[PDB]
CSV table of C-alpha atoms in Angstrom, one decimal:
chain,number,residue,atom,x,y,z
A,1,UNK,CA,-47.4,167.0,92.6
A,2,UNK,CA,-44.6,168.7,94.8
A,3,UNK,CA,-42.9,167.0,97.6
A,4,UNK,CA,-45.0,167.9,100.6
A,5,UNK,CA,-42.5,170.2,103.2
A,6,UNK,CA,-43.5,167.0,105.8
A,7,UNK,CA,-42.0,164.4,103.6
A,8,UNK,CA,-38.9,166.4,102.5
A,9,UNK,CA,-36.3,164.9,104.7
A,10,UNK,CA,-37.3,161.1,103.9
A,11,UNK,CA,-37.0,162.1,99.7
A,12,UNK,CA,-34.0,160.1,100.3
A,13,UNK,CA,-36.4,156.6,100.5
A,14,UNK,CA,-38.6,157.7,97.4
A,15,UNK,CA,-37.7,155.2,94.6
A,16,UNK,CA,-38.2,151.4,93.5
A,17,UNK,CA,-35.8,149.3,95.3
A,18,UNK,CA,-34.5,145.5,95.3
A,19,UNK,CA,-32.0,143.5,97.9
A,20,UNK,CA,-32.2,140.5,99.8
A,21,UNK,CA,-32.9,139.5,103.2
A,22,UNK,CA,-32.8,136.6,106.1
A,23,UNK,CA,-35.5,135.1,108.1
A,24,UNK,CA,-35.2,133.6,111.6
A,25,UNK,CA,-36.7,132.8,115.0
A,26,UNK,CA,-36.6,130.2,117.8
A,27,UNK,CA,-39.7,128.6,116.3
A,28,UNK,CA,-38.5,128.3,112.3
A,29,UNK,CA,-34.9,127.8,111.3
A,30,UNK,CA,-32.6,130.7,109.0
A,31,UNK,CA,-33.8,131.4,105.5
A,32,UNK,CA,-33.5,133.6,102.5
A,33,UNK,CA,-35.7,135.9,100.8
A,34,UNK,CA,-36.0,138.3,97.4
A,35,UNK,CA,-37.8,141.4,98.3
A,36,UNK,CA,-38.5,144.6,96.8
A,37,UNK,CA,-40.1,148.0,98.0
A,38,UNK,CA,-41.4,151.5,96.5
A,39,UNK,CA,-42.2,155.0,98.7
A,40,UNK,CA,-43.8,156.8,96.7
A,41,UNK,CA,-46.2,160.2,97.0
A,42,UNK,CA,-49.2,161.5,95.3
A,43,UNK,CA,-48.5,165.3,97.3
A,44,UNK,CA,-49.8,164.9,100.7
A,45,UNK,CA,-48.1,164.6,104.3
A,46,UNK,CA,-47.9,160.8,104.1
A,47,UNK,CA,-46.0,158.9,102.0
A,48,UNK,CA,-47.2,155.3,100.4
A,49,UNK,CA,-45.2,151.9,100.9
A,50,UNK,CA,-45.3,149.2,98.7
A,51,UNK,CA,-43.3,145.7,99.0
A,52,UNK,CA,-43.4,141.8,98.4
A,53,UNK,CA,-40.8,139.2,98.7
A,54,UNK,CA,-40.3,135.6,96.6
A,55,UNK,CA,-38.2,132.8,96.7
A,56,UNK,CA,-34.8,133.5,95.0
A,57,UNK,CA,-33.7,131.0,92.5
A,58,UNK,CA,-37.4,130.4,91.6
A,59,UNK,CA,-39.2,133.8,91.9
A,60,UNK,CA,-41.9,132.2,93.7
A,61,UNK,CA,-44.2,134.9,95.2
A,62,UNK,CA,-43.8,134.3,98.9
A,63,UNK,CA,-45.7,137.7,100.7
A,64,UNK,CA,-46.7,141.1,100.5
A,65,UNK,CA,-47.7,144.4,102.5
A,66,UNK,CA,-48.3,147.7,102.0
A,67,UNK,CA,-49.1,151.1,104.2
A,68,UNK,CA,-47.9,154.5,105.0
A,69,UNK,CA,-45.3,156.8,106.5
A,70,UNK,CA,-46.4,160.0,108.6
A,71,UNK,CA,-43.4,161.7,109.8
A,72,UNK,CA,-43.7,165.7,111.1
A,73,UNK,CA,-41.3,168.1,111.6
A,74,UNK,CA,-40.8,168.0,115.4
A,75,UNK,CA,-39.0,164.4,114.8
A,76,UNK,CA,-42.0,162.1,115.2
A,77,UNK,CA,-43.1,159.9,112.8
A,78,UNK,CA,-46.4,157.0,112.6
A,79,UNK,CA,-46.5,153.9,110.4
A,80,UNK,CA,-49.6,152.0,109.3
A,81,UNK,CA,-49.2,149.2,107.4
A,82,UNK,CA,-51.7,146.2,106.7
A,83,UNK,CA,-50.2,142.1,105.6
A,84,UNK,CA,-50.8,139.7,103.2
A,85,UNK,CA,-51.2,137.2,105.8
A,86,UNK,CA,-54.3,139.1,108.1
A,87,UNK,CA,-51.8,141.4,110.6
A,88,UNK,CA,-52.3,145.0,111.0
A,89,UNK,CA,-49.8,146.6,113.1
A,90,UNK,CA,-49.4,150.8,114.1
A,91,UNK,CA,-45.8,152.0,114.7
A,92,UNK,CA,-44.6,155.1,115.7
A,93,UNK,CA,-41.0,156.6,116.2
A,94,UNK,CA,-38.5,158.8,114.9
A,95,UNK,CA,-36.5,159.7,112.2
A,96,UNK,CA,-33.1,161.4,112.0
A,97,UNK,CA,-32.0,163.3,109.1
A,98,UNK,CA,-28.1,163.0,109.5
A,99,UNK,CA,-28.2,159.8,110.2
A,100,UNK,CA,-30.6,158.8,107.6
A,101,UNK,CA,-32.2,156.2,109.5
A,102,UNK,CA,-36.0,155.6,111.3
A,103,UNK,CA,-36.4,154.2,114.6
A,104,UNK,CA,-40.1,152.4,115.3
A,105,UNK,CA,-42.1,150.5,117.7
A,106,UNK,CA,-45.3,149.4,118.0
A,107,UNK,CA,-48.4,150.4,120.0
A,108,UNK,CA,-50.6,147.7,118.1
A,109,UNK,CA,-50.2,144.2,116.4
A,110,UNK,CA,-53.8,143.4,115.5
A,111,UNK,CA,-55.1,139.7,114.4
A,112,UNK,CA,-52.2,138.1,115.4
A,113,UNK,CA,-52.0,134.4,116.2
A,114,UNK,CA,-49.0,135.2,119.4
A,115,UNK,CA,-47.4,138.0,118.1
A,116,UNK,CA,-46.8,140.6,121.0
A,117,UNK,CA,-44.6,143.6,119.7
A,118,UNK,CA,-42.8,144.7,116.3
A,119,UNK,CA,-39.2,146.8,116.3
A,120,UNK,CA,-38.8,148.1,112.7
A,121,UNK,CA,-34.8,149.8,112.3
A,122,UNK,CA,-34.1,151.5,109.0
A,123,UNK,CA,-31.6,153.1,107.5
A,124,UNK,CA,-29.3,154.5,104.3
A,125,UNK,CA,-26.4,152.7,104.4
A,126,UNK,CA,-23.8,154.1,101.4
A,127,UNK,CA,-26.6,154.4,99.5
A,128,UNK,CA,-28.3,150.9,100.4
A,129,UNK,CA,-31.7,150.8,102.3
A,130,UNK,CA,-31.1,148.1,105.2
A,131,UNK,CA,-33.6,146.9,107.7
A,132,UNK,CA,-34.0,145.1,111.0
A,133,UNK,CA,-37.4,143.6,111.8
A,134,UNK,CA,-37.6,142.8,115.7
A,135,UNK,CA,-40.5,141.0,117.7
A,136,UNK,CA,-41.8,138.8,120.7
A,137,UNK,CA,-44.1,136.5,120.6
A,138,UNK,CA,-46.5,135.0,123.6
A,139,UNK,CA,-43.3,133.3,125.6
A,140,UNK,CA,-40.0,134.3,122.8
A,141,UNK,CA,-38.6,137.7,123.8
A,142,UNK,CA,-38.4,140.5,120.8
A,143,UNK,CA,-35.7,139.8,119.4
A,144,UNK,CA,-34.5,139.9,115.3
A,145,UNK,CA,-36.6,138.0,112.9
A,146,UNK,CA,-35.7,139.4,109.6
A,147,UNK,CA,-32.9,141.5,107.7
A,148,UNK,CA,-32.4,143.0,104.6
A,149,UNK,CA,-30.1,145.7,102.5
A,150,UNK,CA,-31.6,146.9,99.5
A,151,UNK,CA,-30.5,149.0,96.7
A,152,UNK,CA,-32.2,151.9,94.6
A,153,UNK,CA,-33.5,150.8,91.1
B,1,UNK,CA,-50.6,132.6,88.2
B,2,UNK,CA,-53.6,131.0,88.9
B,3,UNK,CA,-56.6,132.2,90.6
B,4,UNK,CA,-56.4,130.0,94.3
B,5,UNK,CA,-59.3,128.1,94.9
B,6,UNK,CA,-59.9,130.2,97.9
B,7,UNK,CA,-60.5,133.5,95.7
B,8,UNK,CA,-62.2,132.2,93.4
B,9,UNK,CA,-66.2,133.1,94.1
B,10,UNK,CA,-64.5,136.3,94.3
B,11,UNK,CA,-63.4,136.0,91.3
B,12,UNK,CA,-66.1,139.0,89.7
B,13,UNK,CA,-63.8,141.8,92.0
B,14,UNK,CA,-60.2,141.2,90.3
B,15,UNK,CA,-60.1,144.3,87.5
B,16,UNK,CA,-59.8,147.8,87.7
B,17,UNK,CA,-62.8,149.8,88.5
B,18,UNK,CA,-63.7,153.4,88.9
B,19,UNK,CA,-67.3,155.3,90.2
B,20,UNK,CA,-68.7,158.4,91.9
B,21,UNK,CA,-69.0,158.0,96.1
B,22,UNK,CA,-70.5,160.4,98.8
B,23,UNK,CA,-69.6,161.7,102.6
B,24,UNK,CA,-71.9,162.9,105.2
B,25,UNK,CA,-72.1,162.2,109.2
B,26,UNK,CA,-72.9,164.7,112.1
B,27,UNK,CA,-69.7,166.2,112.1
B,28,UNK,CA,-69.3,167.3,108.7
B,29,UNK,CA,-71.2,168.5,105.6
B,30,UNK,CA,-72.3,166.2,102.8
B,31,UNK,CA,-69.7,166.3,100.1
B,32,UNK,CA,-69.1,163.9,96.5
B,33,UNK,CA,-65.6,162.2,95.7
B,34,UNK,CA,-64.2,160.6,92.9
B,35,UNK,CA,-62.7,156.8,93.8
B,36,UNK,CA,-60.6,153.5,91.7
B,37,UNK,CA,-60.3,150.8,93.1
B,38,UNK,CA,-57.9,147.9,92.3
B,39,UNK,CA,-58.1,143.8,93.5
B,40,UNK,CA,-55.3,141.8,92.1
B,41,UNK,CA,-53.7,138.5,93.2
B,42,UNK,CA,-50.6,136.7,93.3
B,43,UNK,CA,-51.5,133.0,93.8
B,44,UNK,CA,-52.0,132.7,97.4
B,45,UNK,CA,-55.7,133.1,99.9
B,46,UNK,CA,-55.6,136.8,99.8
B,47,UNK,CA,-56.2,139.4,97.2
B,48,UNK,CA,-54.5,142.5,96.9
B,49,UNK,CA,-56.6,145.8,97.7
B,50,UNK,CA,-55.8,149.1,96.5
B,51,UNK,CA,-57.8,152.6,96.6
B,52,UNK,CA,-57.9,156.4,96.2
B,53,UNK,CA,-60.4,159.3,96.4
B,54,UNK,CA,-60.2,162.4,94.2
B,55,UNK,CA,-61.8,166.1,93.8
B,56,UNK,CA,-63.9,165.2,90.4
B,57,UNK,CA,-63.6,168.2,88.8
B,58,UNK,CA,-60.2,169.2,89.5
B,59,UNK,CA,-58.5,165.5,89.7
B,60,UNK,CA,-57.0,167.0,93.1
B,61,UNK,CA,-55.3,163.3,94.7
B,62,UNK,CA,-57.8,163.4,98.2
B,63,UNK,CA,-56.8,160.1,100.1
B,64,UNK,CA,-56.0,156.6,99.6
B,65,UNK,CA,-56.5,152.9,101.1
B,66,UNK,CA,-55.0,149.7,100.6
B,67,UNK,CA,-54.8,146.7,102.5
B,68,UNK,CA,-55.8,142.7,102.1
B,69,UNK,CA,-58.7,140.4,101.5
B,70,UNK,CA,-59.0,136.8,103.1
B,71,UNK,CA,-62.1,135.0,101.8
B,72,UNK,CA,-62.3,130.9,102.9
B,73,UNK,CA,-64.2,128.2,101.7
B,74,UNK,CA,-66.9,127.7,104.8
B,75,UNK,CA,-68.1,131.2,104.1
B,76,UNK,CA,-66.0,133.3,106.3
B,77,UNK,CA,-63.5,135.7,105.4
B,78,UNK,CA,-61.1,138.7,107.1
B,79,UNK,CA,-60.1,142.2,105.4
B,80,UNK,CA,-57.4,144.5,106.7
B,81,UNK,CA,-56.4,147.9,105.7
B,82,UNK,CA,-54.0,150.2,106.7
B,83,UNK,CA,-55.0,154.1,105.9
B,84,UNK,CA,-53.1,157.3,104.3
B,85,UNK,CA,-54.5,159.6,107.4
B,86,UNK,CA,-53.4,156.9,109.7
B,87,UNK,CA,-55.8,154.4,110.6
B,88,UNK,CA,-56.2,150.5,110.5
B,89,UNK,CA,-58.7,148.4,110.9
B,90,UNK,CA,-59.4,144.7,111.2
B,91,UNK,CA,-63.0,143.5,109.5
B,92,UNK,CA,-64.3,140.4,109.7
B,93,UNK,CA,-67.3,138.6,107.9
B,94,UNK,CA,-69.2,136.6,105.4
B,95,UNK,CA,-69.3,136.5,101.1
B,96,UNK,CA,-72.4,135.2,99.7
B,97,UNK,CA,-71.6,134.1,95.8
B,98,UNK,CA,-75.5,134.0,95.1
B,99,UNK,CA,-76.0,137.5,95.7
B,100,UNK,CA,-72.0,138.9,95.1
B,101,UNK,CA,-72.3,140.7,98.1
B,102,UNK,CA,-70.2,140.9,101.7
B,103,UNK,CA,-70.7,142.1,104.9
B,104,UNK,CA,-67.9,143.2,106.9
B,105,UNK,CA,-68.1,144.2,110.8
B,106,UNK,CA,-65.1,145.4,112.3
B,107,UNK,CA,-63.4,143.5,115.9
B,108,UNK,CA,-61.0,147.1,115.8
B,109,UNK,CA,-59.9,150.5,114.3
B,110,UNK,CA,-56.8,151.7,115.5
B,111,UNK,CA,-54.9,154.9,116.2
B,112,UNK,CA,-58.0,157.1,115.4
B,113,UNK,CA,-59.4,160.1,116.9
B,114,UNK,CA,-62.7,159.2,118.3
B,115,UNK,CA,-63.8,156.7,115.5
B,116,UNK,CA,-65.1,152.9,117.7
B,117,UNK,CA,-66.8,150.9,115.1
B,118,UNK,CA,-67.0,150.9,110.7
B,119,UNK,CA,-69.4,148.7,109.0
B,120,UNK,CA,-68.0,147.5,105.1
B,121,UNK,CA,-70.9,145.7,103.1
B,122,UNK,CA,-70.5,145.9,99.0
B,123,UNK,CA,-72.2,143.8,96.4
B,124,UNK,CA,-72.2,143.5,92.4
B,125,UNK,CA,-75.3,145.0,90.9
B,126,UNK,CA,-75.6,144.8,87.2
B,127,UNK,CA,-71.8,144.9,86.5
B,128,UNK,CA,-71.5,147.7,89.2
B,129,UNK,CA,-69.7,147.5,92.2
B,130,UNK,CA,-71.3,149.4,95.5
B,131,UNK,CA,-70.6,150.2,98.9
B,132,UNK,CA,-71.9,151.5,101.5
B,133,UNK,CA,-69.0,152.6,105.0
B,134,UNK,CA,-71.6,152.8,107.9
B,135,UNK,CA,-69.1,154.0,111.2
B,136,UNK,CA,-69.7,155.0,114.8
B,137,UNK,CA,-67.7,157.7,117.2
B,138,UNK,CA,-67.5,158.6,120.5
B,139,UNK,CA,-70.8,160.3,121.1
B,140,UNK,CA,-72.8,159.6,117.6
B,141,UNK,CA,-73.9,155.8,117.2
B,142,UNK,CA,-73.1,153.7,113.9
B,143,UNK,CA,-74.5,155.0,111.0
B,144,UNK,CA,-73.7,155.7,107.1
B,145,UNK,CA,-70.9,157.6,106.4
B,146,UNK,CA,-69.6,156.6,102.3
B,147,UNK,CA,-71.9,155.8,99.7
B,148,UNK,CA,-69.9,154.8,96.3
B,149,UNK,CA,-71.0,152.7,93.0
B,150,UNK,CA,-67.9,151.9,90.5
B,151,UNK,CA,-68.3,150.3,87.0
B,152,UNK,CA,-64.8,147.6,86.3
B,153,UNK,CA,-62.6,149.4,83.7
Protein backbone atom coordinates (compact mmCIF):
# COMPACT_ATOMS: atom_id res chain seq x y z
CA UNK A 1 0.00 0.00 0.00
CA UNK A 2 1.14 3.80 -0.02
CA UNK A 3 3.37 5.22 2.56
CA UNK A 4 0.92 6.60 5.18
CA UNK A 5 1.49 10.76 5.39
CA UNK A 6 2.35 9.80 9.31
CA UNK A 7 5.22 7.63 8.51
CA UNK A 8 6.68 9.76 5.69
CA UNK A 9 9.49 11.41 7.42
CA UNK A 10 10.94 8.00 9.04
CA UNK A 11 10.82 6.22 5.04
CA UNK A 12 14.35 6.85 5.67
CA UNK A 13 14.43 3.57 8.35
CA UNK A 14 12.18 1.30 5.93
CA UNK A 15 14.57 -1.56 4.76
CA UNK A 16 16.42 -4.77 5.98
CA UNK A 17 19.52 -3.85 7.83
CA UNK A 18 22.69 -5.67 9.37
CA UNK A 19 25.73 -4.15 11.76
CA UNK A 20 27.18 -5.06 14.89
CA UNK A 21 26.90 -4.01 18.33
CA UNK A 22 28.52 -4.10 22.12
CA UNK A 23 26.97 -5.14 25.35
CA UNK A 24 27.88 -3.90 28.85
CA UNK A 25 26.88 -3.12 32.45
CA UNK A 26 28.34 -3.06 35.93
CA UNK A 27 26.82 -6.48 36.55
CA UNK A 28 28.17 -8.44 33.13
CA UNK A 29 31.48 -7.63 31.48
CA UNK A 30 31.86 -5.91 27.43
CA UNK A 31 30.63 -8.19 24.64
CA UNK A 32 29.84 -8.44 21.00
CA UNK A 33 26.90 -9.07 19.12
CA UNK A 34 25.47 -9.73 15.30
CA UNK A 35 22.19 -8.11 14.91
CA UNK A 36 19.86 -7.25 12.24
CA UNK A 37 16.57 -5.22 11.89
CA UNK A 38 13.56 -4.53 9.30
CA UNK A 39 10.71 -1.40 9.52
CA UNK A 40 8.52 -2.17 7.44
CA UNK A 41 4.59 -1.07 6.57
CA UNK A 42 1.50 -2.74 5.48
CA UNK A 43 -0.17 1.22 4.92
CA UNK A 44 -1.33 2.31 8.22
CA UNK A 45 0.02 5.11 10.78
CA UNK A 46 2.37 2.66 12.55
CA UNK A 47 5.16 1.10 11.25
CA UNK A 48 6.40 -2.68 12.20
CA UNK A 49 9.94 -3.57 13.72
CA UNK A 50 11.55 -6.62 13.44
CA UNK A 51 15.16 -7.67 14.90
CA UNK A 52 17.30 -10.58 16.39
CA UNK A 53 20.95 -10.77 17.27
CA UNK A 54 23.54 -13.99 17.28
CA UNK A 55 26.85 -14.68 18.14
CA UNK A 56 29.38 -13.55 15.45
CA UNK A 57 31.92 -16.14 14.35
CA UNK A 58 29.24 -18.91 15.10
CA UNK A 59 25.79 -17.39 14.09
CA UNK A 60 24.41 -18.72 17.14
CA UNK A 61 20.87 -17.24 17.70
CA UNK A 62 21.28 -15.27 20.85
CA UNK A 63 17.72 -12.93 21.12
CA UNK A 64 14.96 -11.40 19.41
CA UNK A 65 12.11 -8.56 19.67
CA UNK A 66 9.76 -7.11 17.73
CA UNK A 67 6.97 -4.06 17.98
CA UNK A 68 5.99 -0.81 16.51
CA UNK A 69 6.71 2.83 15.76
CA UNK A 70 3.76 5.53 16.11
CA UNK A 71 5.21 8.83 15.31
CA UNK A 72 2.56 11.97 14.39
CA UNK A 73 3.08 15.04 12.80
CA UNK A 74 3.35 17.43 15.71
CA UNK A 75 6.92 15.72 16.63
CA UNK A 76 5.71 12.98 18.95
CA UNK A 77 6.27 9.66 18.57
CA UNK A 78 5.27 6.08 20.88
CA UNK A 79 7.14 2.68 20.71
CA UNK A 80 5.75 -0.74 21.74
CA UNK A 81 7.77 -3.41 21.58
CA UNK A 82 7.55 -6.95 23.27
CA UNK A 83 11.17 -9.52 24.07
CA UNK A 84 12.26 -12.71 23.57
CA UNK A 85 13.15 -12.96 27.07
CA UNK A 86 9.34 -11.88 28.89
CA UNK A 87 9.91 -7.72 28.88
CA UNK A 88 7.39 -5.44 27.57
CA UNK A 89 8.43 -2.00 27.66
CA UNK A 90 6.29 1.50 26.20
CA UNK A 91 8.53 4.41 24.98
CA UNK A 92 7.61 7.62 23.80
CA UNK A 93 9.69 10.57 22.36
CA UNK A 94 10.52 12.50 19.41
CA UNK A 95 11.81 12.45 16.14
CA UNK A 96 13.62 15.06 14.13
CA UNK A 97 13.64 15.03 10.49
CA UNK A 98 16.89 17.04 9.78
CA UNK A 99 18.65 15.35 12.09
CA UNK A 100 17.44 12.07 11.21
CA UNK A 101 17.50 10.72 14.60
CA UNK A 102 14.57 9.54 17.45
CA UNK A 103 14.85 10.37 20.90
CA UNK A 104 12.85 7.83 23.49
CA UNK A 105 12.18 7.06 26.99
CA UNK A 106 10.14 4.95 28.83
CA UNK A 107 6.92 5.26 30.74
CA UNK A 108 6.85 1.29 31.35
CA UNK A 109 9.29 -1.71 31.72
CA UNK A 110 6.87 -4.56 32.39
CA UNK A 111 7.93 -8.19 33.82
CA UNK A 112 11.13 -7.21 34.59
CA UNK A 113 13.37 -8.97 37.05
CA UNK A 114 15.15 -5.09 38.35
CA UNK A 115 14.96 -3.31 35.39
CA UNK A 116 13.74 0.40 36.20
CA UNK A 117 13.90 2.63 32.95
CA UNK A 118 15.03 2.20 29.12
CA UNK A 119 16.75 5.32 26.96
CA UNK A 120 16.55 4.22 23.31
CA UNK A 121 18.83 7.05 20.87
CA UNK A 122 18.68 6.52 17.15
CA UNK A 123 19.91 7.85 14.32
CA UNK A 124 21.21 8.03 10.41
CA UNK A 125 24.59 8.39 10.53
CA UNK A 126 26.13 8.75 6.62
CA UNK A 127 23.72 6.38 5.76
CA UNK A 128 24.28 3.89 8.84
CA UNK A 129 21.53 3.24 11.43
CA UNK A 130 23.32 3.58 14.93
CA UNK A 131 21.86 3.03 18.32
CA UNK A 132 22.28 3.63 22.00
CA UNK A 133 20.32 1.46 24.45
CA UNK A 134 20.39 3.21 28.07
CA UNK A 135 18.91 1.87 31.46
CA UNK A 136 18.93 1.59 35.43
CA UNK A 137 18.38 -1.11 37.21
CA UNK A 138 17.10 -1.44 41.11
CA UNK A 139 20.54 0.17 42.63
CA UNK A 140 22.81 0.81 38.94
CA UNK A 141 21.95 4.26 37.55
CA UNK A 142 20.68 4.37 33.55
CA UNK A 143 23.44 4.43 31.99
CA UNK A 144 24.64 2.69 28.33
CA UNK A 145 24.12 -0.96 27.99
CA UNK A 146 24.30 -1.67 24.36
CA UNK A 147 25.52 0.00 20.93
CA UNK A 148 25.29 -0.70 17.52
CA UNK A 149 25.74 0.93 13.75
CA UNK A 150 23.97 -0.86 11.17
CA UNK A 151 23.92 -0.59 7.50
CA UNK A 152 20.97 -0.83 4.82
CA UNK A 153 20.72 -4.25 2.96
CA UNK B 1 17.47 -26.03 15.13
CA UNK B 2 15.90 -28.12 17.45
CA UNK B 3 12.57 -27.84 19.08
CA UNK B 4 13.76 -26.89 23.14
CA UNK B 5 12.47 -29.19 25.41
CA UNK B 6 10.60 -26.33 26.93
CA UNK B 7 8.35 -25.89 23.64
CA UNK B 8 7.86 -28.95 22.96
CA UNK B 9 3.98 -29.93 24.28
CA UNK B 10 3.54 -26.98 22.29
CA UNK B 11 4.79 -28.36 19.67
CA UNK B 12 0.96 -28.73 17.66
CA UNK B 13 1.15 -24.42 17.38
CA UNK B 14 4.50 -24.06 15.26
CA UNK B 15 3.00 -23.72 11.39
CA UNK B 16 1.27 -21.21 9.66
CA UNK B 17 -2.42 -20.92 10.11
CA UNK B 18 -5.19 -18.89 8.85
CA UNK B 19 -9.35 -18.73 9.99
CA UNK B 20 -12.39 -16.30 10.18
CA UNK B 21 -12.69 -14.32 13.85
CA UNK B 22 -15.49 -11.89 15.19
CA UNK B 23 -15.69 -8.42 17.31
CA UNK B 24 -18.44 -7.22 19.55
CA UNK B 25 -18.46 -5.34 23.13
CA UNK B 26 -20.75 -2.41 24.39
CA UNK B 27 -19.04 0.06 22.70
CA UNK B 28 -19.07 -1.05 19.24
CA UNK B 29 -21.13 -3.14 16.70
CA UNK B 30 -20.56 -6.75 15.97
CA UNK B 31 -18.31 -7.01 12.95
CA UNK B 32 -16.22 -10.34 11.17
CA UNK B 33 -12.31 -10.17 10.36
CA UNK B 34 -10.02 -12.15 8.53
CA UNK B 35 -6.70 -13.26 10.73
CA UNK B 36 -2.97 -15.63 10.11
CA UNK B 37 -1.28 -16.35 12.59
CA UNK B 38 2.43 -17.46 12.67
CA UNK B 39 4.51 -19.42 15.86
CA UNK B 40 8.09 -20.19 14.97
CA UNK B 41 11.23 -20.82 17.05
CA UNK B 42 14.73 -20.35 17.15
CA UNK B 43 16.12 -22.85 19.66
CA UNK B 44 15.67 -21.18 22.92
CA UNK B 45 12.22 -21.31 25.83
CA UNK B 46 10.20 -18.97 23.80
CA UNK B 47 8.43 -19.14 20.52
CA UNK B 48 8.00 -16.47 18.14
CA UNK B 49 4.33 -14.98 17.81
CA UNK B 50 3.18 -13.20 14.83
CA UNK B 51 -0.47 -11.91 13.74
CA UNK B 52 -2.72 -9.73 11.47
CA UNK B 53 -6.40 -9.01 10.87
CA UNK B 54 -7.94 -8.26 7.44
CA UNK B 55 -11.31 -6.92 5.66
CA UNK B 56 -12.26 -10.64 4.03
CA UNK B 57 -13.64 -9.43 1.10
CA UNK B 58 -11.52 -6.71 0.16
CA UNK B 59 -7.95 -8.15 1.71
CA UNK B 60 -7.84 -4.40 3.16
CA UNK B 61 -4.50 -4.97 5.93
CA UNK B 62 -6.82 -4.05 9.43
CA UNK B 63 -4.17 -4.56 12.31
CA UNK B 64 -1.55 -6.67 13.50
CA UNK B 65 0.16 -8.40 16.80
CA UNK B 66 3.20 -9.95 17.56
CA UNK B 67 4.94 -10.64 20.56
CA UNK B 68 6.47 -13.95 22.59
CA UNK B 69 5.53 -17.16 24.24
CA UNK B 70 7.18 -18.69 27.41
CA UNK B 71 5.78 -22.12 28.24
CA UNK B 72 7.83 -24.13 31.34
CA UNK B 73 8.04 -27.56 32.29
CA UNK B 74 5.85 -27.38 35.83
CA UNK B 75 2.90 -26.13 33.79
CA UNK B 76 3.27 -22.48 33.92
CA UNK B 77 4.02 -20.22 31.22
CA UNK B 78 4.12 -16.14 30.31
CA UNK B 79 3.03 -14.41 26.77
CA UNK B 80 3.85 -10.85 25.86
CA UNK B 81 2.77 -8.77 23.06
CA UNK B 82 3.33 -5.49 21.91
CA UNK B 83 0.33 -4.04 19.50
CA UNK B 84 0.17 -1.98 16.02
CA UNK B 85 -2.53 0.60 17.82
CA UNK B 86 -0.19 0.77 20.68
CA UNK B 87 -0.78 -1.47 23.44
CA UNK B 88 1.13 -4.19 25.51
CA UNK B 89 0.32 -6.51 27.64
CA UNK B 90 1.82 -9.00 30.00
CA UNK B 91 -0.38 -12.61 30.34
CA UNK B 92 0.37 -15.08 32.47
CA UNK B 93 -0.91 -18.79 32.84
CA UNK B 94 -1.14 -22.47 32.44
CA UNK B 95 -0.87 -25.13 29.05
CA UNK B 96 -2.61 -28.37 29.52
CA UNK B 97 -1.06 -30.92 26.71
CA UNK B 98 -4.14 -33.36 27.38
CA UNK B 99 -6.62 -31.01 26.23
CA UNK B 100 -4.12 -28.53 23.81
CA UNK B 101 -5.55 -25.72 25.33
CA UNK B 102 -4.23 -22.45 27.50
CA UNK B 103 -5.51 -20.03 29.65
CA UNK B 104 -3.98 -16.68 29.84
CA UNK B 105 -4.96 -13.91 32.54
CA UNK B 106 -3.31 -10.75 32.24
CA UNK B 107 -1.13 -9.00 35.59
CA UNK B 108 -1.22 -5.60 32.87
CA UNK B 109 -2.15 -3.77 29.57
CA UNK B 110 -0.35 -0.79 29.00
CA UNK B 111 -0.71 2.70 27.37
CA UNK B 112 -4.50 2.01 26.51
CA UNK B 113 -7.39 4.11 26.56
CA UNK B 114 -9.73 2.74 29.14
CA UNK B 115 -8.96 -0.98 28.55
CA UNK B 116 -8.02 -2.85 32.66
CA UNK B 117 -8.09 -6.46 32.12
CA UNK B 118 -7.92 -9.16 28.69
CA UNK B 119 -8.53 -12.75 29.14
CA UNK B 120 -6.47 -15.10 26.23
CA UNK B 121 -7.62 -18.85 26.38
CA UNK B 122 -7.16 -21.00 22.82
CA UNK B 123 -7.16 -24.78 22.38
CA UNK B 124 -6.68 -27.29 19.36
CA UNK B 125 -10.05 -28.76 18.25
CA UNK B 126 -9.95 -31.19 15.50
CA UNK B 127 -6.82 -29.71 13.77
CA UNK B 128 -8.37 -26.22 14.39
CA UNK B 129 -6.94 -23.60 16.36
CA UNK B 130 -9.60 -21.21 18.49
CA UNK B 131 -9.68 -18.40 20.58
CA UNK B 132 -11.66 -16.64 22.35
CA UNK B 133 -10.15 -12.45 23.73
CA UNK B 134 -12.57 -11.85 26.76
CA UNK B 135 -11.45 -7.95 28.10
CA UNK B 136 -12.80 -5.41 30.62
CA UNK B 137 -12.81 -1.30 30.56
CA UNK B 138 -13.43 1.27 32.68
CA UNK B 139 -17.10 1.08 33.22
CA UNK B 140 -18.09 -2.44 31.42
CA UNK B 141 -16.84 -5.61 33.40
CA UNK B 142 -14.71 -8.47 31.59
CA UNK B 143 -16.43 -10.11 29.03
CA UNK B 144 -15.96 -11.52 25.26
CA UNK B 145 -14.71 -9.39 22.90
CA UNK B 146 -12.76 -11.80 19.78
CA UNK B 147 -14.00 -14.98 18.75
CA UNK B 148 -11.57 -16.66 15.91
CA UNK B 149 -11.09 -20.53 14.68
CA UNK B 150 -7.88 -20.93 12.24
CA UNK B 151 -7.05 -24.26 10.31
CA UNK B 152 -2.68 -24.64 10.16
CA UNK B 153 -1.71 -23.95 6.43
Amino acid sequence: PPVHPFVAPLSYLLGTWRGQGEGEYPTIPSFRYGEEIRFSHSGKPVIAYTQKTWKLESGAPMHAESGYFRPRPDGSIEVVIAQSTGLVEVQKGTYNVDEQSIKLKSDLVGNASKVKEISREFELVDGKLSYVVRMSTTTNPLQPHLKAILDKL
